[PDB]
Amino acid sequence: MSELEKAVVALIDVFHQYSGREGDKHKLKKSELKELINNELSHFLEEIKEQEVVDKVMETLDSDGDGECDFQEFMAFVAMITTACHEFF
């Protein structure tokens, strides 16, 4: 009901929208990660139009080295975005 609580539900809701598309329903594979970014982060990140950007992003976010982005790794990605957003500001 508060805007922060709305933010918490959004984080959960969007991760699962994408993670559940294919394979492990609790992790984002590259194609799921790419679409999440392109569809849902278009005001903060440049549309990914090259395979190697998809690959490099996953390499960066894939902290435990299993080829996918789990929810912990996703939150780290969100922390990275949110931090980078101020600054600017």
Binding site: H43, I81, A84
Partner: peptide
């Protein structure tokens, strides 16, 4: 606000 990509990585 493009926040991107090398920043990031």
């Amino acid at each position: 606000t493009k926040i991107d990509w090398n920043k990031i990585l």
